[PDB]
Swiss-Prot record, chain B:
Contains a secondary binding site for benzoate in addition to a primary effector binding site that can accommodate either cis,cis-muconate or benzoate. The existence of this secondary binding site may explain the synergistic effects of cis,cis-muconate and benzoate. Positive regulator of the ben and cat genes for benzoate degradation. BenM is necessary for ben gene expression but not for expression of the cat genes, which can be regulated by CatM. Binds to the inducers cis,cis-muconate and benzoate. Residues 1-58 form the HTH lysR-type domain. Residues 18-37 bind DNA. This is HTH-type transcriptional regulator BenM. Belongs to the LysR transcriptional regulatory family. Homotetramer; dimer of dimers. The dimers can also associate to form linear, higher oligomers (in vitro).
DNA sequence: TAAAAATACTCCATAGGTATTTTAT
DNA sequence: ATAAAATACCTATGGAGTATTTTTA
């Protein structure tokens, strides 16, 4: 598990398309699709419904998404706050 | 950045040695150093002091450090709960 | 001075790309 | 029929290794 997997996962959910996700992320659709499989096979959990356009989360997906964005958000504050402090000497 | 960078950094700080943390993480010391460099380099900050046997954080480090340990703990939480749901136990 | 951290490469595992097929409209 | 996702294969960036040179206690 890396932030990469989350950020990728989040892009899929928000955008409801590996394609549109892959565009926004500036990578191709397959490698994206593989990183999602990887995430899932690592958790042994199915995060996205297979067999439907648009692309929708499973109950577990939705739970995970919720903690994903909150957790990515927290990384971003962690970095900001840290930079402000590097101006104290 | 990535969780690898955090976990590594945390390891380092906890051991107060790159060398001790290296094999703690089952990797070599030199790559470790580089990862920690890139981290500081990406943030454009100095998270560790520029030289001390008992290697210790800067202020920026300490803050990051504690926050890091909270985030990694978050990732664990996230995984446990999802797992917990997936397993069929609410 | 003798430990521990930093270079200077080498190697390879794997994230990312290309071509094609399969599935779901 | 036709676009998007899945599958297979290939490439190449950077994570990890070995040998070696700085460091600072």
């Amino acid at each position: 598990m890396e932030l990469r997997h989350l950020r990728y996962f989040v892009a899929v959910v928000e955008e409801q398309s590996f394609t549109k996700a892959a565009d926004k992320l500036c990578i191709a659709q397959p490698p994206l699709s593989r990183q999602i499989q990887n995430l899932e096979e690592e958790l042994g959990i199915q995060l996205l419904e297979r067999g439907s356009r648009p692309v929708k989360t499973t109950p577990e997906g939705h739970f995970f998404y919720q903690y994903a964005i909150k957790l990515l958000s927290n990384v971003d504050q962690m970095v900001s706050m840290t930079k402000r402090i590097a101006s104290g000497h």
